Design a protein around this nucleic acid. Structure first.
Lengths: 511, 744, 638
RNA sequence: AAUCU
RNA sequence: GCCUGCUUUUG
RNA sequence: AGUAGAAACAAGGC
């Protein structure tokens, strides 16, 4: 029984020409249709419409990109401009104390100088970065004279690293009844980000990520013994895949990031109050089968009391390089760049003596970003899956396996990039490396802009495909779709590059 | 040469490579602070698209409520919540006309369900907003606290154990002047933890019973900007359970729905429906497909239209049924909304920060805020009542999806060619906030006319179509809930990509889940065999690095690299060890469907085999059959589903530790209650072993049944068996003392 | 003895006493799920974060007297800190490996019997026989299939009480066990699991996985049985089949079902060929089912179905000219019959197409616990005599006969929700659905059938709606008799001849079977049928048939393009387009053929007209014998 | 030759 | 000095 | 400073 309060709420929960639930029930029970929808349509304005806008070849315009100062670099480690010192240590991926390997790989370099600054930061205090380098060197020295490498080096908490790691920068948390009459008390700044225009360096980074190399970067677990024929088929397929995939700079970045993010997460949970030195180490197997260890630089972790997934741990990155910072300074907005030495390469220029720089930075990361960079190997699947699909799509047609034909004979090709004189085609391995690098860059340059752009451009890609398939496509509001795509292009280099690629696709398609 | 992957789409079609367009190898977007702003935005939006209606003041809450039903007709293509009763009822009538007996039969099924079901059904589900605490708690905790306050006040019908009696109780609780509740605290100087009574006048109880909690949704794939979502309470839960039961029963009988079916059932139904349409269509007839989304779907849809629908579907049924299904749309027409955490303020000169709760936005000077937020608060301040905003004219995200699908199919059923009275016609497929329409006509003019009539017939009900996100092509290709149909459905594989790592349950469970997703993706998706071998290798690397279980013939120093070497050297047969104990991987495509213990059972040493698989281990915990080998996993583009994994109970089947933050909060005393209840229940399972397999039934106190069974088992085990006379006398003495403690 | 002391210790306290006394047993169910929170919203990250710290695992507190606080190297294995809402204590993952290298031992001989399903998979992969790999164009179709086939006797409501009696024999209550299979399973599992201490809960979970049935929608090619679905990731791909044959023993339902489907497909092709019998023999030799060849099953297995009978007779065997319906075994004894492909409505207004038969005909129904004799006409029952044992046996026979009669008195007696499609818009069979509807109770079919008078001949008994014999007036056509033993053992197989075109004939000369009596239905085998002649798709299904036909003509385009111009009659009468023609309806084959041949001929006549798509599209329709016509087509049905 | 979530 | 590192996340 | 991006972190609570 509905009675009392719940009757009243019932009477106030109906259309407006009713005052009682029971009269409404009676109206419903006596409802027979006598053409109401027709009348209400006849009354409604004819401006309410769904007019079909055709989609032709001359219809789609380019996506407009933002205007502003050029885009800078925002990764957690250097991609193309990085240098590695090596000693040829015969130990596998996770084996060996890393500080010892680091000291050993630093001993093998001769050419150190007194450090001085080449390119300052313009919003920081560069002597602190310099002094932090010097402190790193002092600590590497006093490690050797300790009689046992400890696997975990804490640093002294001094002014330089307190500044560079953001200590006592947060404001204090108080009660509102004790901060009412304050002048500048206001809301947190919540505004549209600063716009930033595309630059040329992101495409060169991507071109180098798609390249072959003279070393191996991934050693895979063993699996069982193959008992069925399809297991042997899969094994030869896998041999080809692994060959193409172990020789690629993208895999080098995978292993780098996995190492660093693993190390940072573990040190962050283990040592929350202490500062900690963490070398960047990698392991390769060069062309002659020799194992090599490789040092890319150093990281100093700060305090890591992370009560929340988005809370930030700050760190100071130091990386070696040979690349002059005076030729693309807009790329290095967030960096101080020192000069630390000289290096003699395999020289036809007498002996070379090319200088040697240290790129220094403050950066930061979160638990979820670490977690997702701790598992970048999934990228290897994505690429490879697509590749096998293509192979299988032909093996069904020609009733035979086609991995050998594709990988050896280079019969079939697919378009991969734009050169002067136009579209250029590549082999299945080039496609594999290109998609692998795409996934790696999605993981490294991940943003909400990429999510948005991917969805909103999926739609346009599909209507273009419907035009190429000759299916008479149409729209209702296309400028709304464009305004929705352009709403996400703000400041991320990777997203603007994808948009540039989409414009090139529309130019080469739609013909 | 400069590289462009998108040019690959110049040779391979977009659906056969759509996996490239899904950036699901990177971190997803997250929210960081309050969600008050998005709440305000949704409130003011749904009051904007329904503004030409009429305002009223409820006599019970005092709240200003906006009624747009049977309001004016739209004049432009902007969203509108001006629904018309006559057209909704005409839609339902023609639906029953085309599929007779649907409402009768569905009502009979739901009547059986209403009569049989129990209160325990509310324990299983998602979290629930507890008015007793003014925050979210699990479902069973909220149920228990609600029942406690009811019994403390006088409502005791739920002792019957049925749900409908609990609903009679929550209804009878609204006609009470002063409800009473109890609140937790704790004080330390000595940690004192206690309780205190307080009172709740009738209007306060009503606003608390009618309100919903709001929060921002993290880990959303596919959006630049964050969304707000709602969570309903305990009192609106049984009613909506019955309503969605009815809606399920109806939608099951409709060839257009997609909501009650999942996985391959969904795709099968979609494909069968498309084939049926293309067979019923003619050869001289032109055919087109709209791939469509609806804009502002959850703000336009009004509960009053749902009440109309309910009263038409319960036509010629018993009044108790008509009256127990009419309460959900009522209570969602007088609903409210908590705004949330609030905001935080910053001073640079003095170097300080502050927090501002949402329950002072009516009593705070607007100098602090910026323009957008100032406008928001300026618009919303009329609707504030005790820290919660009135929200009549629309739903919230994630509720009544079934009945909304029923309305969508009602509109799709108006294209049968006996209801259009013309030569064009239409049909399609509907899920909540997504649809595929198929329109047939002998020319393009009829196509445009059918599209126009669909748009207008849907605007007469409050269904607005997103022109910005919809497109029309010929039949053969379309998109539906991230399923890309191209003359047949197509595999994507990037939706399933975050399911290829360590799941984070335990060693055995993570292992089994890891191999099981590989073989599933081999079946359902198009993961090849070589790529599956690689997936094995990579999964085993992640497994070993996470759980610190390396081969044992390695030199990788971890915190348990010493125990594993000792185990390695003791062991003779090393192919019989588990990857979690420092052993090899014998998995391949041939044998992905077998657990890790049966795979290697003849290779084990007997001592290891008996240590590992031992029931006396202190690490294992099995509680109830519905939680034995079943784990919650969190996909991309979906809710947290439950996965079944085949495994053997070993010493690796451990549970991990708890959050432990609640120690520092006023609500610390929930731990002690939990602990005591668990003591009592454990002892009950000692006496009654079946209590974890089959639900007990009884009215006696637990101690009574316990001591009774003790006496019975004592007698039967002394008569012919183990128990001697001394034990008999002693335990009977203990039973006697238990009686002297309980009865006095 | 020790648990009653714990009860005393609880009752001594004040809060716990208040919980024990003022808490009913139906409320225990709610408070046992009471907690502060047990939900991780990202468990992966929590594991990564927690396994980086010390003591992330929990265990019972008695570990303190089973494992030491630290090992010889000095690493601590457990802590003194307790979990939040528990008595459990925090420990490390080192206590686990310590237990596994130095912990107590047990006997693990019971374990392969509790976890029987898993070790059965093991033994069934061990004794399996692999075969070659074939690359081809594969079409998968989505279907409901069994993961666990369960015990066929228990119905999934008896199984739970069986589980209760085995594991929890004193907490079962009033339920006695009735069927003999229940007692058999109970004593078997009860003497096996006598004094085990694994856990009752896990034993029950595994017995459920043994006994109850479990289904799933998946995309399937090849075999549908459960032994073939656990290995579908290995046998079937997107481009490749892997021959495989599991090692255990196979149920015979699967075998006879798969033989029936194989024989149906074989006969369907063979009928449209030039010499059906030769083709039929070659197909039966070159095919095998579940590894075992087809001739072996055909010689060993007695199965009642028309296509199997044609196959057997072609092998020169004795046939049982018979079939099955509703569990009863029908043998015609008079009259001819033809199907009609008609449409009608129900009492619940659902529309349906069925195949109604022609002619007056008599039949000899047989069963397990009944027997009957039936006479009927087109859509109309003529007479029915019955010889059942119990009254409900006669009820079963009568409802089966009524459904078999196809009378409108039965069609217009359907009331309720009877959906003639699946939950995925899949067309079930109408007859089976009606027969399932009238098996709850056929009260309306009895109260709506009719009444007649009787001659009181033989002293035969009258019919019963609800056990009420009526010895002078009764239902029309329906009588009853009584027998203590079998009337006649009609399992007596006869010898036959066969024409080229598969017309079976008895010793006299009359006709008994024909390729028109085989079903027009398209099923999906339970065991994987393997065909090795040259092309492995000619009995696989219509979708595969279409894809592989068009793919073949694509690959051989270089010589078809020139054979199409010179000597084209030798291209239409080709052995590759015969599986296709089985899908074209028999009425519109020659019309399509004449249409298409005239198309191609006048496409050759005028110069400057050539479209390879048209030729590749319309050739499988020109295979058939040509019937001339005057009309035109906008499409072509398959 | 099938109708069980 | 003590305590904490998801106590509120639609379908 | 830096992370980030419509609101937060740059440790928090008593």
């Amino acid at each position: 029984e509905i009675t009392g309060t719940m009757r009243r709420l019932a009477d106030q929960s109906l259309p407006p020409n009713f005052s009682c639930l029971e009269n409404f029930r009676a109206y419903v029970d006596g409802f027979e249709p006598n053409g109401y929808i027709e009348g209400k349509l006849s009354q409604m304005s004819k401006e309410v419409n769904a007019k079909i806008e055709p989609f032709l070849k001359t219809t789609p315009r380019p996506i407009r990109l933002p205007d502003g100062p050029p885009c800078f670099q925002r990764s957690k480690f250097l991609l193309m401009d990085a240098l590695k010192l090596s000693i040829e240590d015969p130990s596998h991926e996770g084996e060996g104390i890393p500080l010892y390997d680091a000291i050993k790989c630093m001993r093998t370099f001769f050419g150190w100088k007194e450090p001085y600054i080449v390119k300052p930061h313009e919003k920081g205090i560069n002597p602190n970065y310099l002094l932090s380098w010097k402190q790193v060197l002092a600590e590497l020295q006093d490690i050797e004279n300790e009689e046992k490498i400890p696997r975990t080096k804490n640093m002294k908490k001094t002014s330089q690293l307190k500044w560079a790691l953001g200590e006592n920068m947060a404001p204090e948390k108080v009660d509102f009844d004790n901060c009412r009459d304050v002048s500048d008390l206001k809301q947190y700044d919540s505004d549209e980000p600063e716009l930033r225009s595309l630059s040329s360096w992101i495409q060169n980074e991507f071109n180098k990520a798609c390249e072959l190399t003279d070393s191996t970067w991934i050693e895979l677990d063993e699996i069982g013994e193959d008992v069925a024929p399809i297991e042997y088929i899969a094994s030869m397929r896998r041999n080809y895949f692994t060959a193409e995939v172990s020789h690629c700079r993208a895999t080098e970045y995978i292993m780098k990031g996995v190492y660093i993010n693993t190390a940072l997460l573990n040190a962050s949970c283990a040592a929350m109050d202490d500062f900690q030195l963490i070398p960047m180490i990698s392991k390769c197997r060069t062309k002659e089968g020799r194992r090599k260890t490789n040092l890319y630089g150093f990281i100093i972790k700060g305090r890591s009391h992370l009560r929340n997934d988005t809370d930030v741990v700050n760190f100071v990155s130091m990386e070696f390089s040979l690349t002059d910072p005076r030729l693309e300074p807009h790329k290095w907005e967030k960096y101080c760049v020192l000069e630390i030495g000289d290096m003699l390469l395999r020289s036809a220029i007498g002996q070379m003596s090319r200088p040697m720089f240290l790129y220094v930075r403050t950066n930061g990361t979160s638990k979820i970003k670490m977690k997702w960079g701790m598992e970048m190997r999934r990228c290897l699947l994505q690429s490879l899956q697509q590749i096998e699909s293509m192979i299988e799509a032909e093996s069904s047609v020609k009733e035979k396996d086609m991995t050998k034909e594709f990988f050896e004979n280079k019969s079939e090709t697919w378009p991969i990039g734009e050169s002067p004189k136009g579209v250029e085609d590549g082999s299945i391995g080039k496609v594999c490396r290109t998609l692998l690098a795409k996934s790696v860059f999605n993981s490294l340059y991940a943003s909400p802009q990429l999510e948005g752009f991917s969805a909103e451009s999926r739609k346009l890609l599909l209507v273009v495909q419907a035009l190429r398939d000759n299916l008479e496509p149409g729209t209702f509001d296309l400028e709304g779709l464009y305004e929705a795509i352009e709403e996400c292009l703000i400041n991320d280099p990777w997203v603007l590059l994808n948009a540039s690629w989409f414009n090139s696709f529309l130019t080469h398609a739609l013909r | 040469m400069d590289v462009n992957p998108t040019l690959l789409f110049l040779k391979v079609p977009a659906q056969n490579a759509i996996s490239t367009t899904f950036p699901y190898t990177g971190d997803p977007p997250y929210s960081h602070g309050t969600g008050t702003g998005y709440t305000m935005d949704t409130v003011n939006r749904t009051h904007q698209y329904s503004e030409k209606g009429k305002w009223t003041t409820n006599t019970e809450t005092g709240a200003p409520q906006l009624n747009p039903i049977d309001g004016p007709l739209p004049e432009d293509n902007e969203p509108s919540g001006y629904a018309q009763t006559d057209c909704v009822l005409e839609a339902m009538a023609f639906l029953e006309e085309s599929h007779p007996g649907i409402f009768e039969n569905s009502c009979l099924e739901t009547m059986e369900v209403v009569q049989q079901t129990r209160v325990d059904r509310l324990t299983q589900g998602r979290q629930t907003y507890d008015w007793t605490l003014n925050r979210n708690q699990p479902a069973a905790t909220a149920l228990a606290n609600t029942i406690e306050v009811f019994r403390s006040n006088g409502l005791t019908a739920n002792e019957s154990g049925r749900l409908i009696d609990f609903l009679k109780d929550v209804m009878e609780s609204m006609d009470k002047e002063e409800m009473e509740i109890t609140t937790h605290f704790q004080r330390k100087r000595q940690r004192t933890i206690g309780k205190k009574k307080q009172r709740v006048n009738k209007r306060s109880y009503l606003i608390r019973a009618l309100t919903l909690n709001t929060m921002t949704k993290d880990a959303e794939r596919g959006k630049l900007k964050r969304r707000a979502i709602a969570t309903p309470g305990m009192q609106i839960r049984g009613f909506v359970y019955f309503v969605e039961t009815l809606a399920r029963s109806i939608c099951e009988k409709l060839e257009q729905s997609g909501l009650p079916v999942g996985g391959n059932e969904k795709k099968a139904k979609l494909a069968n429906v498309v084939r049926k349409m293309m067979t019923n269509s003619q050869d001289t007839e032109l055919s087109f497909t709209i791939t469509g989304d609806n804009t502002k779907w959850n703000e336009n849809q009004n509960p009053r239209m749902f009440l109309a629908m309910i009263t038409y579907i319960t036509k010629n049924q018993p009044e108790w049924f008509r009256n127990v299904l009419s309460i959900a749309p009522i209570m969602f027409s007088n609903k409210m909304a908590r705004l949330g955490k609030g905001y935080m303020f910053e001073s640079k000169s003095m170097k300080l920060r502050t927090q501002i709760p949402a329950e002072m936005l009516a009593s705070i000077d607007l100098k602090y805020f910026n323009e957008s937020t100032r406008k928001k608060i300026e618009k919303i301040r009329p609707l504030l009542i005790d820290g919660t905003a009135s929200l009549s004219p629309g739903m919230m995200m994630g509720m009544f999806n079934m009945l909304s699908t029923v309305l969508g199919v009602s509109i799709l059923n108006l294209g049968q060619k006996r209801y259009t009275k013309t030569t064009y016609w239409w049909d399609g497929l509907q899920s909540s906030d997504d649809f595929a329409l198929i329109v047939n006509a002998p020319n393009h003019e009829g196509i445009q006319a059918g599209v126009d009539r669909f748009y207008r017939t849907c605007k007469l009900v409050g269904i607005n179509m997103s022109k910005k996100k919809s497109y029309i092509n010929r039949t053969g290709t379309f998109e539906f809930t991230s399923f890309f149909y191209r003359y047949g459905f197509v595999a994507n594989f990037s939706m399933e990509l975050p399911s290829f790592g360590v799941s984070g349950i335990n060693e055995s469970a993570d292992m089994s889940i890891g191999v099981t997703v590989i073989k599933n993706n081999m079946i359902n998706n198009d993961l090849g065999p070589a790529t599956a071998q690689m997936a094995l290798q990579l999964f085993i690397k992640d497994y070993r690095y996470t759980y610190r279980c390396h081969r044992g013939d390695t030199q990788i120093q971890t915190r348990r690299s010493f125990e594993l070497k000792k185990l390695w050297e003791q062991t003779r047969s090393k192919a019989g060890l588990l990857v979690s104990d420092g052993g090899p991987n014998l998995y391949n495509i041939r044998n992905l469907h077998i657990p890790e213990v049966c795979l290697k059972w003849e290779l084990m040493d007997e001592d290891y085999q008996g240590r590992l698989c031992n029931p006396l281990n202190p690490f294992v915990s099995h509680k109830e059959i519905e939680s034995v080998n079943n784990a919650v996993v969190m996909p991309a583009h979906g809710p947290a589903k439950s996965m079944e994994y085949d495994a053997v109970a070993t010493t690796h089947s451990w549970i991990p530790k708890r959050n432990r933050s609640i120690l520092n909060t006023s609500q610390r005393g929930i731990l002690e209650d939990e602990q005591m209840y668990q003591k009592c229940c454990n002892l009950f399972e000692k006496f009654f072993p079946s209590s974890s397999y089959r639900r007990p039934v009884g009215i006696s106190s637990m101690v009574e049944a316990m001591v009774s069974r003790a006496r019975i088992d004592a007698r039967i085990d002394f008569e012919s068996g183990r128990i001697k006379k001394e034990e008999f006398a002693e335990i009977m003495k203990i039973c006697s003392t238990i009686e002297e403690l309980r009865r006095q | 003895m020790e648990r009653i002391k714990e009860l005393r210790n609880l009752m001594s306290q004040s809060r716990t006493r208040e919980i024990l006394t003022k808490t009913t047993v139906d409320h225990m169910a709610i408070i046992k799920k009471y907690t502060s929170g047990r939900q991780e919203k990202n468990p992966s990250l929590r594991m990564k974060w927690m396994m980086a710290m010390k003591y992330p695992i929990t265990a019972d507190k008695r570990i303190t007297e089973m494992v030491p606080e630290r090992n010889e190297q000095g690493q601590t294995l457990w802590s003194k800190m307790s979990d939040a809402g528990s008595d459990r204590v925090m420990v490390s993952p080192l206590a686990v490996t310590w237990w596994n290298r130095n912990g107590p031992m047990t006997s693990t001989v019971h374990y392969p019997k509790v976890y029987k399903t898993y070790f059965e998979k093991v033994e069934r992969l061990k004794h399996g026989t692999f075969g070659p790999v074939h690359f081809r164009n594969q079409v998968k179709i989505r279907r409901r299939v069994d993961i666990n086939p369960g015990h066929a006797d228990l119905s999934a409501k008896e199984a739970q009480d069986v589980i209760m009696e085995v594991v929890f024999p004193n907490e079962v209550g009033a339920r006695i066990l009735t069927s003999e299979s229940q007692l058999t399973i109970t004593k078997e599992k009860k003497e096996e699991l006598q004094d085990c201490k694994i856990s009752p809960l896990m034993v029950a979970y595994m017995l459920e996985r043994e006994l109850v049935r479990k289904t799933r929608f998946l995309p399937v090619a090849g075999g549908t049985s459960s032994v073939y679905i656990e290995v579908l990731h290995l046998t079937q791909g997107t481009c490749w089949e892997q021959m495989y044959t599991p090692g255990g023993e196979v149920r015979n339902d699967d075998v006879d079902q798969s033989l029936i489907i194989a024989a149906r497909n074989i006969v369907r092709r063979a009928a449209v060929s030039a010499d059906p019998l030769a083709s039929l023999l070659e197909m039966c030799h070159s095919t095998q089912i579940g590894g075992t060849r087809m001739v072996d099953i055909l010689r060993q297995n007695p199965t009642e179905e028309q296509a199997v009978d044609i196959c057997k007779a072609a092998m020169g065997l004795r046939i049982s000219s018979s079939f099955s319906f509703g569990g009863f075994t029908f043998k015609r004894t008079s009259g001819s019959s033809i199907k009609r492909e008609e449409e009608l409505l129900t009492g619940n207004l659902q529309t349906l197409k069925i195949r109604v038969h022609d002619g007056y005909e008599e039949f000899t129904m047989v069963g397990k616990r009944a027997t009957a004799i039936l006479r009927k006409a087109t859509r109309r029952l003529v007479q029915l005599i019955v010889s059942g044992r119990d009254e409900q046996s006669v009820a079963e026979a009568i409802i089966v006969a009524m459904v078999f009669s196809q009378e409108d008195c039965m069609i217009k007696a359907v009331r309720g929700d009877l959906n003639f499609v699946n939950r995925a818009n899949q067309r079930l069979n109408p007859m089976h659905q009606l027969l399932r509807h009238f098996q709850k109770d056929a009260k309306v079919l009895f109260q709506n059938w009719g009444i007649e008078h009787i001659d009181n001949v033989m002293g035969m008994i009258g019919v019963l709606p609800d056990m009420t014999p009526s010895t002078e007036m009764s239902m029309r056509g329906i009588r009853v008799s009584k027998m203590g033993v079998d009337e006649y053992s009609s399992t007596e197989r006869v010898v036959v001849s066969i024409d080229r075109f598969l017309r079976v004939r008895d010793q006299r000369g009359n006709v008994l079977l024909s390729p028109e009596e085989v079903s027009e239905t398209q099923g999906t085998e339970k065991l994987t049928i393997t065909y090795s002649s040259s092309m492995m798709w000619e009995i696989n299904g219509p979708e595969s048939v279409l894809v592989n036909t068009y793919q073949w003509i694509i690959r051989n385009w270089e010589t078809v393009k020139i054979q199409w111009s010179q000597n084209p009659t030798m291209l239409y009468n080709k052995m590759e387009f015969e599986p296709f023609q089985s899908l074209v309806p028999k009425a519109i084959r020659g019309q399509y053929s004449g249409f298409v041949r005239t198309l191609f001929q006048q496409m050759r006549d005028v110069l400057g007209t050539f479209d390879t798509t048209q030729i590749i599209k319309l050739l499988p329709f020109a295979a058939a014998p040509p019937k001339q016509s005057r009309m035109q087509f906008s499409s072509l049905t398959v």
